[PDB]
Design a protein around this ligand. Structure first.
Ligand SMILES: [Mg+2]
Lengths: 244, 266, 93, 1083, 183, 154
DNA sequence: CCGCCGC
RNA sequence: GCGGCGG
């Protein structure tokens, strides 16, 4: 982006090819590959699962006494894992950051290359919560990692989700850019022909967002603010922090 | 730009699979509609006051002398409370809003800004990063038509192009005297209907019904001013946009040798 | 990418403008003969099987190459429509 | 090669007859192998008894149905486009009111297709498959109400489609709601009709409900009993005679509407258990004694009131539970249409009872095979269920042979409603693969069935389990019905056992689709094997346990598209089913009984059994598969060999040695190259092309007909009207092209002449090859069905060798799919310390995002097998484990590096250098000897590899191994038309194609926009003009280019012109105008 | 499918072609790998003329027969083709044409085989991976069409996305991977 | 209506919303990268990232709902067991001591110091409205055990 | 959405 | 228009 604004269009094209060339070469000589051992399981996984496991017995003994409602039991257990799983997440990463800075699987993920934190976790840590047919997530988590054999049932259970996702990708894909269609229908006559139109009736782009937690003025996210102001033309002049 | 905006908004639609959203929210938004979970907007701008329980609750915007009664079912979720102010078109219920109502209460400059943002809302939550420019270009066309309440040329039950009226009114007060004000009412037609009833006949002959379109365009000897990609496509002529751009379709190249050579012809 | 496309863009008030000039100019390069150039001396385009790009490979390449320099002029209404093509045939064999 | 398998879960019983679905279904469908004395009770015969006892007085009864002389043989049916059907007739006797006379005789009523030993059919020429079907098994269910969260509604559903859809609902306002076919009426109204009196009714029904105040309400209509039958009739929408015309009521009685499903288990099962108890007859049928008996009605409501009252038994029925889902086996499907034909025939015969002179009418006068034939024929050739047999490779056809579809009749399931059905339901366990479903629209709706999944008496896919008593596991297996499985606490097979005794305290089990940790004392049933959880198709992926279910699918489906390679190699690492697939599929040919071999021809194999019989087994030499793939049987037995019973005599299409093989095992380095394996590209070593590693044979069947025009018969001769002799060489046989000739694009394959001319089957642009077989059907047809007008037909088979090239796409069983980007010279591709170079280089990057470690596993084990020279068999969830692999890899280090020490040399300066970067990487334990180090690095599954281009190592061990990869039915032969100009439609002016000219890609508006946006003015103009409609534009364009000139400027597109006129043709007057509003001329 | 809906809904193009795409690592965003054999047919007319320009053929009809059945045409016909394509470019299209980048222009560099070599960086623009996806290619006939095609339509000129001002020539997985390991 | 929480409950829940906010911003990035990735498109990547993102957004909505209209009751003093009250129950026979604190359904958490039990919880229902000295029972899977409100503490 | 293959 | 596959 910087190169584009700074040195011009085609020159940037040159740099891209440049990066493209080196990136690739260095890529081949770097010697990066995947091996089942490359997906390293954190020693603490056996810990956090045990810690969470016993913790599950407390929740059980607590209901087998009559303290927690049928529902409370459930919600509390999910919470148990929802956190336990996230715990194991940062753990695997902590292990790579401190011990194997140059892990193939890891390096791939960190670098904009490939892999996603959530996936990395399904290999080294463990993919834990997969929901039932309807939507209500399962009570038991998928204790395994892909590194180790994902069990018979854990697999089956996980199946439900993969299928719902496939169905979703279907009817959503075949929509055939339906919107690209209608959009085009109402904007297919809009074009740019002009001389600085004289009418100065402008739109003021808001820099602050109202309520979500309650009434409290916040600074709209960096992203969104950009979206509304980037490449725009100021209606009227504005002295802000010292610049005109 | 028309295209470019339509495109940038369409591609992303492929990944948008109580309150309801996703593509449907995008279709509901581009199409002026009454969403699933409607939220009663406040038509009057004053302060708020409630009346609790009773098989029905009630939110009341009252001030100077009148209060706009809002019936909030015993199963609604209202977040404005007994006490403070509420501008026209402010969410009195929780959830989605209805454009038409919001247009009446607050006004147009609000509908527009509502649509734009409420649209972005979905793409943002879906990772997509598209410039507001585009949602704007579209939305603008959603209100390029207005109704008539005070006539001068044609009768007051018509729905015609907003700008075509800025021409009538401009020359009715400016060039030719007799200030016959052409009072109009901003109209929020849906994206689809904006298209449906798009001024040029050529274009109509394409989607709706080719019979009706030509029928009417026949009677009033219609002159299709060739501007717009669709209509001009049929002509098989160079599109009014791109290189066809009236701005550059006519450009001449000469060499200092032949230029002084035209002076040699003089 | 392209040779000084940056420079080119900076010479026109609008993108599409560039294309038009570029094109029509390529037209004149072949229509009124292929010698209607302005930078044929040392430093004219070229190919690699032999040095024959000196005659007629790609027209546009020339155009742009010629426009990169302050030789040609382009405008909304520079020269009367018909008179242009008449004078050109006369001074170019 | 030694074969070592790591299975530790005692696989108790062998897999069932994989194609049993179809096979047995047809056998029992039409019991034609055994006599009528013990003739069946279902299929054919049942459908017969159904509509046979005819009563119009007339009386025509069924005796015996016999059939069995197949007009012609299989192959003949294929070469002649003939449908392989059996002749079917039956003895029918007509009894007369004149008790003293009767008539027996036989009438042949059409031909019915037969089932092949593989399980496929042969309709019009080609082989087709009748796929299974699923639906709401005609029964009675109770589901919650739509909007009103209040109470639930009752449903009564019985096929066929003619049968009424009944529902039962209770409303606030008042009483019952029983809506049949778009309308509702009082539930009592009918009750009264039948005999249920206010008194008796209320008592037994509301003895616990209080709703009853709903039924006993008639104080006006409830005091007239029969009259209520007439009352109900008035409630029919149509105005009709109130004279007791049971008719529409006769309809929902016993005959048509409800069901004739076998009495006892068909619908009754849904009865007895689910609700109520006993069934009388077949359905709510009893129109006997003036009064009616409906032992079904009150119960349905009798459960409604129980449902809304207490827990008499909690019946909330889960629709998708396979226990209320039946699967339609071929048989039921064919039999179904059969009884429809039976009905259609029974229709005319009754008409022919009043139509003629009494005894003057006999069999013929009552029977016309017209109905039944069109009936059956229509199903096999028109029903949306019978399809082309996907035979890319045996496995493929086999899956397509057993997959279940939801869409079909339309009365079972449609298109726009499926989010619910698409999910893999709880009950799909062992009954439906959760992986076999296809990607894209139509997902989860069409899927192949499980391993041991076998259809029972009436559909409900049953699965096998192992009853366990106390801490003892048994071999006594039971095939449970989806519903029955919920009653028990079943446990997994992974449960450690000491023979028959469990081994752990907290031993996993699943109550009802719910994971629960149970005790050894509560384990009532155990899973047979992990296999049963998936399909055959899936059961073929090595380390499935390490592969994300989403990609596993891609992996299963990809095998279905594997293409037969000349050199077939079984996977260096197998699942354990490869043997079986080739076996129950009928690719290879086995030996029936023990004996010896006689002749081992390359066309036939004759063996002598030790019992006293010598048979000649011909081998389909080189046959054209449905998908155009080679199908040859290559004898693997030598002359005079003592063969064991059930031993491979010859190998099938991809099954070499008797194992299934599709693609080959190649040495592969898993690293990144320049960019040749960028997103999903693959790099291949020219070395592969050299040993014809990846080469498949293909055949294209071009067909030409000698049509009979009223302008003069199109003769087929060597006479080529335009004077060529150089193009008439190959065409030596007067008319036909000679076998063994080389046909290139544009040569004449077959000649023909027609009226004002040369109309000859030519080699369509693309390619041809070598003509290998030819078929001509002249006048005196032996037993072929030549369509009308069709004088004679000519078929020409052409084939060629497919060597792997850059466009081709391969992929492994795990899901890594990709196309060949560059074919590298062995010269400079990744070679190992010892001269051995790799075959293919997979880009690492495609493994993390997608989750399929399974491949990286297979590769490790595959590495051991290379230097250990051995193939392995790793079970689904029970296969090889990470420790055992490292063990075999350790063995492999002594072969790789061991021979290295003796041969005379040590470590390279290169090997040492990569070891430095490896220890600094944390792959090797610092401080150990290079020898020791490399071993530890090899065990990781990574070795050292030198560039090949530079001879310098690739800093960092790289993993390598034998990965089993296949070539897909994707040749680039179907992927590239290059059109400069040619034929245009004569109706619309479009560059359509046909024979010599390719077509032009469409441009659609979706792409025009693309252009518009760019500001691509002329580029767009060009696409709508010079390239499409301006007949003068494209003309000037062509010319100009011929001239090396500058294309002319566009004149008004004919579309503009054509519009002005179309507008002139009517009142409308479209006039084009100038600057100052004045005229302008297009012409 | 009437007549008013005819001029818009679309149709098939002359001078078109389509094939399976394959990654071309060395290739620069500027160019694109196109199969000579395809180019031959694609640029047939343009080739014919150049054939007469060079003694290879006496006339057009001759040049045509010359390509009617003859197997190679070796270096010379090829020398001519490669000469005719000099600075011309072609367009490429991807399966669903979603945004303006759905079609980009590249300079063809003749190559062996069947597949079409595409630049890695543009693989993001056209939703296109190499598991068998196929792209269609077109040719700008007019010197005006050619102009716009290579000026405002070429790949290297459309770096930024019209959607957001963010780049679309972003380095993908492989490149990044390398660049990172080295820094 | 109204949701009641303790000052401790408020802080705990408020912080939870904060943490979930950072998680939502991180799940965002990932999703954005995937959508622009489009290399090995149409796979688990998107559906997974979007699904995870959803589970998050849901916990956020329920957190922002409860926190926007909850009341705070300052009850360190009083006698009867009410919301916020930390009771201690002693099993008669065995003399087993138990520490519990009844709170609104949203504050419940078996992981807290005194086990936070829902107001609308069986055990939570039985305890509300009683004082030091009281004796009561409820149903339990193994049977029914009565406890005596040992003392009521702030 | 675009491309193909066949009654 | 029906069916099958690919992106
Ligand atoms: Mg793809």
């Amino acid at each position: 982006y910087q190169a584009f604004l700074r040195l011009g269009m085609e020159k940037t094209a040159r740099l891209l090819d440049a990066l493209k060339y080196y990136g690739f070469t260095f890529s081949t000589t770097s010697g990066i590959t995947i091996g089942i051992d490359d997906a390293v399981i954190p020693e603490e996984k056996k810990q956090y699962l045990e810690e969470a496991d016993r913790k599950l017995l407390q929740i059980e003994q607590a209901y087998e006494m009559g303290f927690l409602t049928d529902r409370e039991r459930y919600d509390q257990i999910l919470q148990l894992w929802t956190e336990t799983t996230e715990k194991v997440t940062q753990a695997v990463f902590k292990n790579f950051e401190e011990n194997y800075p140059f892990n193939p699987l890891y390096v791939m993920a960190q670098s904009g290359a490939r892999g996603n934190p959530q996936q990395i976790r399904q290999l080294c840590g463990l993919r834990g919560l997969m929901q039932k047919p309807s939507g209500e997530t399962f009570e038991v988590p998928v204790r395994s990692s892909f590194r180790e054999g994902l069990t018979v049932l854990e697999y089956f259970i996980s199946s439900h989700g993969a299928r719902k996702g496939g169905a979703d990708t279907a009817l959503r894909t075949a929509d055939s850019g339906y919107l690209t269609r209608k959009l085009v229908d109402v904007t297919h006559e809009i074009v740019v022909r002009e001389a600085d139109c004289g009418t100065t009736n402008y739109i003021s782009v808001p820099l602050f967002q109202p309520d979500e937690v309650t009434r409290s003025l916040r600074l709209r996210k960096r992203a969104d603010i950009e979206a509304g102001l980037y490449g725009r033309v100021l209606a009227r002049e504005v002295e802000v922090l010292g610049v005109r | 730009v028309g295209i470019v905006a339509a495109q940038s908004i369409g591609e992303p639609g492929t990944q948008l699979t109580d309150i309801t959203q996703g593509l449907p929210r995008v279709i509901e938004l581009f199409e002026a509609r009454r969403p699933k979970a409607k939220a009663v907007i406040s038509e009057i701008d004053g302060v708020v006051r409630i009346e609790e329980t009773e098989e029905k609750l009630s939110v009341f915007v009252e001030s100077e002398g009148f209060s706009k009664e809002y019936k909030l079912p015993k199963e609604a979720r209202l977040l404005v409370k007994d006490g403070d102010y509420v501008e026209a078109g402010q969410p009195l219920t929780r959830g989605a809003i209805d454009p038409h109502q919001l247009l009446e209460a607050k006004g147009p400059e609000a509908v527009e800004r509502y649509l734009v943002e409420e649209i972005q809302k979905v793409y943002r939550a879906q990772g997509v990063k598209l410039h507001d420019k585009h949602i704007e270009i579209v939305v603008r066309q959603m209100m390029k038509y207005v109704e008539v309440t005070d006539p001068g040329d044609s009768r007051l039950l018509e729905g015609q192009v907003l700008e075509k009226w800025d021409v009538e009114a401009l020359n009715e007060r400016l060039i030719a005297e007799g200030k016959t004000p052409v009072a109009w009412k901003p109209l929020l037609m849906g994206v689809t209907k904006s298209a449906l009833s798009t001024k040029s006949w050529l274009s109509a002959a394409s989607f709706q019904n080719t019979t009706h379109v030509l029928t009417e365009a026949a009677i009033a000897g219609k002159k299709d001013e060739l501007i717009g990609l669709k209509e001009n496509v049929i002509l098989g002529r160079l599109i009014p946009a791109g290189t066809g751009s009236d701005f550059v379709r006519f450009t001449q190249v000469v060499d200092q040798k032949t230029l002084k050579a035209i002076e040699e012809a003089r | 990418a392209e040779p000084g496309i940056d420079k080119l863009f900076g010479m026109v008030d609008s993108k599409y403008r560039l294309t038009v000039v570029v094109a029509k100019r390529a037209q004149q390069l072949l229509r009124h003969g292929f010698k209607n150039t302005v930078l044929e001396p040392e430093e004219r385009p070229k190919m690699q099987t032999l040095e024959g790009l000196f005659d007629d490979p790609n027209a546009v390449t020339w155009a742009m190459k010629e426009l990169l320099t302050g030789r040609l002029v382009f405008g909304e209404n520079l020269v009367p429509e018909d008179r242009l093509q008449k004078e050109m045939e006369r001074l170019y064999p | 090669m030694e074969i070592k398998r790591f299975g530790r879960i005692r696989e108790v019983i062998p897999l069932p007859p994989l194609t049993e679905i179809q096979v047995e279904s047809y056998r029992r469908a039409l019991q034609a192998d055994v006599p009528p004395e013990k003739r069946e009770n279902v299929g054919i015969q049942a459908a017969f008894r159904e509509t046979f006892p005819i009563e119009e007085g007339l009386v025509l009864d069924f005796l015996e149905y016999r059939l069995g002389e197949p007009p012609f043989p299989q192959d003949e049916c294929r070469e002649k486009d003939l449908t392989y059907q059996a002749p079917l007739y039956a003895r029918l006797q007509l009894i007369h009111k004149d008790t003293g006379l009767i008539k027996e005789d036989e009438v042949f009523l059409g031909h019915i297709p037969l089932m092949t030993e593989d399980g496929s059919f042969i309709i019009n020429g080609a082989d087709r498959v009748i796929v299974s079907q699923i639906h709401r098994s005609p029964g009675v269910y109770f589901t919650p109400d739509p909007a009103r969260p209040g109470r639930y509604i009752a449903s009564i559903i019985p096929l066929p489609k003619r049968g009424p859809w009944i529902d039962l609902e209770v409303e606030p306002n008042g009483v019952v709601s029983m809506k049949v076919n778009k309308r509702k009426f009082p539930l009592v109204l009918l009750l009264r009709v039948l005999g249920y009196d206010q008194e008796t009714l209320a008592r037994e029904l509301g003895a616990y409900g209080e709703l009853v105040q709903g039924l006993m309400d008639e104080s006006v209509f409830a005091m007239r009993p029969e009259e209520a039958l007439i009352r109900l009739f008035t409630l029919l929408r149509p105005g009709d005679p109130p004279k007791r015309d049971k008719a529409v009521a006769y309809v929902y009685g016993l005959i048509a509407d409800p069901r004739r499903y076998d009495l006892g288990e068909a619908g009754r099962y849904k009865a007895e258990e689910k609700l109520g108890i006993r069934l009388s007859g077949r359905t709510l049928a009893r129109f006997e004694d003036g009064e009616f008996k409906d032992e079904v009605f009150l119960p349905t409501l009798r459960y409604l009131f129980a449902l809304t009252a207490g827990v008499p038994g909690h019946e909330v029925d889960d629709i998708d539970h396979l226990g209320n889902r039946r699967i339609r086996t071929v048989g039921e499907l064919m039999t179904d249409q059969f009884r429809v034909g039976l009905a259609r025939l029974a229709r005319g015969v009754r008409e022919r009872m009043l139509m003629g002179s009494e005894d003057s009418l006999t069999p013929a006068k009552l029977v016309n095979s017209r109905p039944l034939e069109a009936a059956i024929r229509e199903f096999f050739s028109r029903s949306q269920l019978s399809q082309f047999k996907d035979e890319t490779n045996p496995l493929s056809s086999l899956r397509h042979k057993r997959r279940i579809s939801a869409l079909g009749p339309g009365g079972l399931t449609r298109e726009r409603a499926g989010f619910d059905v698409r999910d893999v339901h709880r009950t799909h366990y062992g009954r439906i693969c959760p992986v076999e479903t296809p990607e894209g629209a139509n997902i989860g709706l069409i899927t192949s069935l499980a391993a041991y999944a076998r259809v029972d008496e009436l559909g409900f896919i049953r699965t096998p389990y192992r009853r366990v008593v106390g801490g003892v596991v048994t071999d006594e297996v039971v095939y449970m019905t989806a519903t029955e499985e919920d009653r028990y606490t079943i446990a997994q097979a992974n449960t450690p056992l000491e023979g028959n005794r469990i081994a752990a305290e907290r031993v996993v089990a699943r109550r009802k689709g719910e994971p629960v940790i149970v005790s050894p004392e509560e384990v009532e049933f155990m899973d047979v094997s992990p296999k049963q959880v998936f399909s055959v198709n899936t059961n073929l992926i090595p380390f499935l346990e390490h592969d994300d279910a989403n990609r596993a699918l891609m992996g299963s489906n990809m095998q279905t598209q594997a293409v037969p390679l000349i050199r077939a190699q079984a996977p260096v690492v197998m699942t354990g089913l490869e043997e079986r697939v080739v076996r129950d599929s009928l690719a290879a040919l086995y030996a029936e009984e023990d004996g010896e071999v006689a002749k081992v021809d390359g066309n036939r194999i004759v063996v002598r059994y030790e019992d006293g019989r010598l048979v000649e087994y011909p081998l389909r030499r080189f046959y054209r598969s449905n998908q155009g793939t080679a199908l040859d049987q290559r004898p693997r037995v030598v002359v005079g060999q003592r063969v064991r019973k059930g031993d491979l005599l010859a190998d099938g299409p991809a099954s070499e040695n008797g194992f299934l093989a599709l693609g080959q095992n190649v040495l592969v380095a898993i690293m990144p190259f320049d960019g040749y394996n960028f997103e999903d590209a693959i790099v291949i070593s020219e070395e592969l092309l050299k040993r014809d590693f990846y080469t498949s044979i293909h055949i294209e069947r071009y067909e030409i007909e000698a049509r009979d025009t009223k302008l003069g018969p199109e003769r087929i001769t060597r006479d080529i009207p335009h004077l060529s002799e150089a193009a008439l060489r190959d065409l030596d046989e007067e008319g036909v092209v000679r076998i063994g000739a080389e046909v290139k694009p544009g040569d004449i394959l077959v000649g023909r002449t027609s009226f004002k001319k040369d109309t000859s089957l030519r080699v369509p642009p693309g390619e041809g090859g070598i003509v290998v077989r030819t078929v001509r059907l002249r006048r005196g047809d032996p037993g072929v069905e030549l369509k009308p007008g069709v004088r004679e037909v000519v078929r020409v088979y052409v084939a060629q060798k497919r060597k792997l090239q850059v466009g081709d796409k391969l992929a492994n069983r795990h899901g890594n799919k990709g196309v060949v980007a560059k074919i590298l010279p062995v010269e400079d591709m990744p070679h190992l310390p010892d001269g051995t170079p790799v075959d293919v280089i997979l880009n690492p990057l495609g493994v993390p995002s997608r989750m399929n470690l399974g491949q990286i596993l297979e590769t490790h084990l595959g590495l051991a097998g290379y230097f250990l020279g051995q193939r392995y068999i790793s079970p689904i969830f029970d296969g090889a484990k990470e420790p055992e692999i490292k063990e075999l890899l350790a063995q492999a280090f002594e072969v790789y590096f061991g021979k290295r020490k003796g041969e005379g040399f040590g470590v390279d300066k290169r090997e040492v250098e990569v070891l430095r970067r490896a220890e600094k990487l944390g792959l090797v334990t610092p401080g150990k000897t290079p020898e020791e180090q490399l071993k530890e690095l090899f065990l990781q599954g990574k070795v050292v590899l030198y560039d090949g281009r530079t001879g310098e190592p690739i800093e960092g061990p790289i993993v390598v191994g034998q990965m089993f990869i296949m070539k897909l039915y994707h040749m680039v032969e179907d992927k590239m038309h290059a059109r400069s100009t040619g034929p245009y439609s004569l109706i619309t002016q479009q560059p359509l194609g046909g024979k010599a000219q390719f077509g032009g890609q469409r441009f659609g508006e979706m792409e025009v926009w693309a252009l518009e946006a760019y500001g691509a003015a002329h580029t767009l103009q060009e696409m709508l003009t010079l390239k499409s409609d301006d007949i003068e534009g494209r003309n000037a364009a062509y010319e100009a280019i011929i001239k090396g000139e500058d294309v002319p400027e566009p004149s008004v597109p004919e579309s503009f012109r054509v519009l002005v006129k179309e507008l002139q043709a009517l009142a409308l007057d479209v006039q084009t105008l100038d600057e100052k509003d004045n005229p302008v001329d297009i012409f | 499918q009437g007549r008013f809906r005819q001029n818009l809904l679309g149709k098939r193009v002359d001078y078109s072609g389509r094939s399976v795409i394959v990654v071309g690592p060395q290739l620069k965003l500027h160019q694109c790998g196109l199969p000579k054999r395809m180019a031959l047919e694609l640029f047939k007319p343009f080739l014919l003329k150049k054939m007469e320009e060079k003694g290879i053929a006496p006339n057009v009809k001759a040049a045509r027969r010359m390509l009617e059945r003859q197997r190679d045409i070796k270096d010379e016909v090829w020398d001519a083709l490669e000469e005719v394509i000099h600075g011309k470019v072609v367009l490429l299209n991807r399966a669903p044409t979603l945004h303006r980048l759905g079609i980009q222009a590249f300079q063809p560099v003749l190559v062996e085989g069947q597949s079409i070599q595409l630049h890695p960086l543009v693989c993001e623009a056209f939703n296109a991976d190499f598991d068998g996806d196929q792209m269609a290619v077109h040719v700008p006939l007019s010197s005006f069409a050619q102009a716009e095609a290579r000026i405002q339509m070429l790949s290297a000129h459309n770096l930024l996305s019209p959607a957001s001002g963010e780049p679309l020539a972003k380095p993908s997985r492989d490149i990044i991977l390398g660049l990172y390991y080295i820094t | 209506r109204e949701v009641k929480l303790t000052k401790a409950g408020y802080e705990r829940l408020m912080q939870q919303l904060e943490r979930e906010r950072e998680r939502l911003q991180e799940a965002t990035k990932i999703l954005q990268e995937l959508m622009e990735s489009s290399d090995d498109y149409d796979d688990s990547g998107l559906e997974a990232a979007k699904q995870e993102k959803a589970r998050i957004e849901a916990r956020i909505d329920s957190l922002e709902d409860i926190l926007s209209r909850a009341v705070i009751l300052e009850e360190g003093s009083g006698e009867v067991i009410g919301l916020g009250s930390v009771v201690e129950l002693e099993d008669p026979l065995s003399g087993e001591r138990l520490s519990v604190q009844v709170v609104s359904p949203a504050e419940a958490n078996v992981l807290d110091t005194p086990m936070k039990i829902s107001d609308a919880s069986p055990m939570g229902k039985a305890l509300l409205g009683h004082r030091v000295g009281d004796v009561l029972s409820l149903d339990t899977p193994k049977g029914r055990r009565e406890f005596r409100v040992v003392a009521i503490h702030g």
